[PDB]
From Swiss-Prot:
It is found in: Secreted. This is Lysozyme C. Lysozyme C is capable of both hydrolysis and transglycosylation; it also shows a slight esterase activity. It acts rapidly on both peptide-substituted and unsubstituted peptidoglycan, and slowly on chitin oligosaccharides. The keyword Membrane does not apply. It comes from Gallus gallus (Chicken).
Length: 129
């Protein structure tokens, strides 16, 4: 599923990401835009051989199991394919664990390089929500 911007904002808010670990909704929408272009089916291989999955490009080195990332943890205890669903519940539950790991949203490199410090409220502009 390719979410619309406000469509994704409402889903994320319903699932409790707005102000989760102090990060406003616009931060999460901005991260999803640059990680996946709002596409739940996005997958991208990393140079270390792990893969990033879904709307928030959650990585198989630590968070989900894809069976092809040697030395991997599965801290969200979920198959990585479950992060590609049209329902974002699993991705959000897993993202809450990631953002609680110590470095906040800097865990998403695209958030640090493209969202951090910017006017992230623009990402929820016009949304009813
Ligand atoms: Cl915001
Ligand atoms: Cl923080």
């Amino acid at each position: 599923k390719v979410f619309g911007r406000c469509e994704l904002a409402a889903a994320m808010k319903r699932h409790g990401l707005d102000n989760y670990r102090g990060y406003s909704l616009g931060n999460w929408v901005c991260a999803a835009k640059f990680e996946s272009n709002f596409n739940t089916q996005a997958t991208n291989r990393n140079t270390d051989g792990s893969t990033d999955y879904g709307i928030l490009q959650i990585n198989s080195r630590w968070w989900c199991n894809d069976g092809r990332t040697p030395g991997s943890r599965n801290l969200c205890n979920i198959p990585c394919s479950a992060l590609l669903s049209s329902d974002i519940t699993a991705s959000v539950n897993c993202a809450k664990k990631i953002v609680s790991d110590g470095n906040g949203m800097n865990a998403w490199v695209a958030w640090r390089n493209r969202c951090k410090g910017t006017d992230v409220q623009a990402w929820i502009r016009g949304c009813r929500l």
